């Protein structure tokens, strides 16, 4: 079975239903809160697990009730933390405020996401190490540096967006794969050797050594799009090819990512909707 | 010592500080996040206690490890918890967001604080009832109903607004002094005895027997207004003569308030930011 490494965040996503946001000044009652696990890193890990990977979570967690409901997640999923720390102070924290209008507003808090610090013997015989833009640039650089070491891929996930562009040069630069959407490719300082872009429906596109080429998605009527880019990260990083690897081997990991994101819209929320290696298979068979 | 009942709530406090308040559909990135006790009903207890009143809380906790680190709280600080009750499920919880004006937005799931009944004795030997509106406002109605025989002053935080209108109809009948700002004050069903309308920095409106008037708070460079408006009605209640009262007690009342809660927003933080009565005195003294 593939050996995985992620190295990323872990937040307790709060949703609240509400008629409206507060004003200034202003205190509103919400209908509802529903604390669900999520974070990037936490979600890619369960994908990946969930699509046949043997999985280890490097991530920080809080001291608060949150941080042991993470953990809990992350176990049940089959996901390892031996090599996770543990940090003062709130968990990472996302506030999803869903309006009369179903506007969704959401604020975050790195807390203890920011405390994350490397754990390179984690990334040991490791085939994959996976790691995305939600911990310290430093941090994941510095997994990159031991995946470079213990000749495991280093795949990036590009998200989120925005970050400072001279902050991602060295960690561009040490990159095999590079996954980011059109909005996040846009915000990576140079191409990898091989460059993932996801299309939303469409399913990928591909630039890199191996050419130039759309992934197609399976057709599916969507019921909830969110989680499904951590789905196709994680499934991405349970199937790449340990190096040296071959195009047919890299071009079997895209389609089945992409047909693991496609699943991943069927199913309402993040934290759940990760597909099992076998209904990937069935999908492809189905095309 | 008066002595100070307040019936109301408590949540677990997850403050937020922001460059800007989020608009709808926005994603924001916090600038930091700290995970406090606090609550209306918690903080004004608080308040009151630390103006020199003895104290009595009733509220709703629920079974859960939050509430252990609430009632640490409140014991922290000799407010007394012998009427309190635990409820089976999540204690309350707020998200306080804080942003560069020092204004604040406070968005509330109550959790166990909806599910606070009537307790025989909750309002046993008070000089003073204090309640607001995030338990049931038939709760409120009980308790006011029980101090009113007992000739208490029934004090009522009118926040947030929108609460159950027939119960607030009752409750607004019997109100001795109602605490609002303005946007909650226009939403009360009628007017008090005493209905003390908070201004902000310019401390406070009153409109009733007494009259019509402005009553001014100390100048000072905000911090965090967040917790402010509950500084000023547990210190109200700290200072508020017994039934039928002089109009020169209840100016030393409100005179008293406006400064606490001017202190209030020189300290980040939401729960823990109610002065000691001495400086109160120390911040009149100055003017
Ligand atoms: N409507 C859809 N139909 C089929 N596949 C989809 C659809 N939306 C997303 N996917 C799959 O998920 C991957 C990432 O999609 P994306 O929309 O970026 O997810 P997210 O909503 O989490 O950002 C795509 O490459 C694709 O395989
Ligand atoms: O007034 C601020 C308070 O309102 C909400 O009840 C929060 O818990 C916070 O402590
Ligand atoms: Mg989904
Ligand atoms: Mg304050």
Chains 1, 2 share one sequence.
């Not at 996976?130 to 891929?153: C, F, H, K």
């Not at 280093?154 to 561009?172: F, H, I, K, W, Y």
Request: charged share 15%; hydrophobic share 50%.
């Amino acid at each position: 079975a593939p050996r995985v490494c992620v190295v990323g965040s872990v937040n307790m996503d709060l949703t609240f239903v509400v008629d409206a946001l507060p004003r200034p000044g202003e205190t509103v009652l919400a209908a509802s809160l529903t604390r669900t696990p999520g974070g990037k890193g936490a979600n890619q890990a369960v994908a990946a697990a969930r699509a046949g990977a043997q999985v280890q979570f490097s991530g920080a967690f809080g001291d608060d009730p949150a941080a042991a409901q993470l953990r809990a997640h992350l176990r049940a999923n089959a996901v390892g933390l031996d090599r996770t720390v543990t940090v003062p102070g709130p968990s990472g924290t996302a506030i999803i405020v869903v309006d009369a209008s179903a506007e969704n507003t959401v604020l975050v808090a790195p807390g203890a996401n920011a405390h994350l610090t490397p754990v390179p013997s984690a990334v040991a015989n490791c085939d994959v190490l996976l790691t995305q833009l939600e911990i310290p640039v430093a941090t994941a650089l510095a997994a990159a540096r031991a995946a470079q070491s213990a000749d495991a891929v280093v795949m990036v996930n590009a998200s989120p967006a925005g970050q400072d562009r001279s902050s991602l040069q060295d960690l561009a630069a040490i990159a095999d794969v590079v996954i980011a959407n059109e909005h996040e490719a846009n915000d990576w300082p140079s191409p990898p050797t091989h460059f993932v872009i996801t299309l939303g429906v469409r399913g990928a596109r591909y630039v890199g050594a191996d050419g130039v080429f759309e992934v197609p998605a399976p057709t599916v009527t969507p019921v909830d799009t969110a989680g499904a880019g951590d789905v196709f990260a994680g499934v991405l990083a349970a199937n790449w090819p340990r190096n040296p690897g071959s195009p047919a081997e890299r071009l079997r990991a895209l389609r089945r990512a992409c047909a693991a994101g496609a699943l991943a819209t069927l199913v309402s929320g993040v934290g759940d909707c990760a597909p099992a290696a076998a209904a990937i298979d069935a999908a492809l068979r189905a095309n």
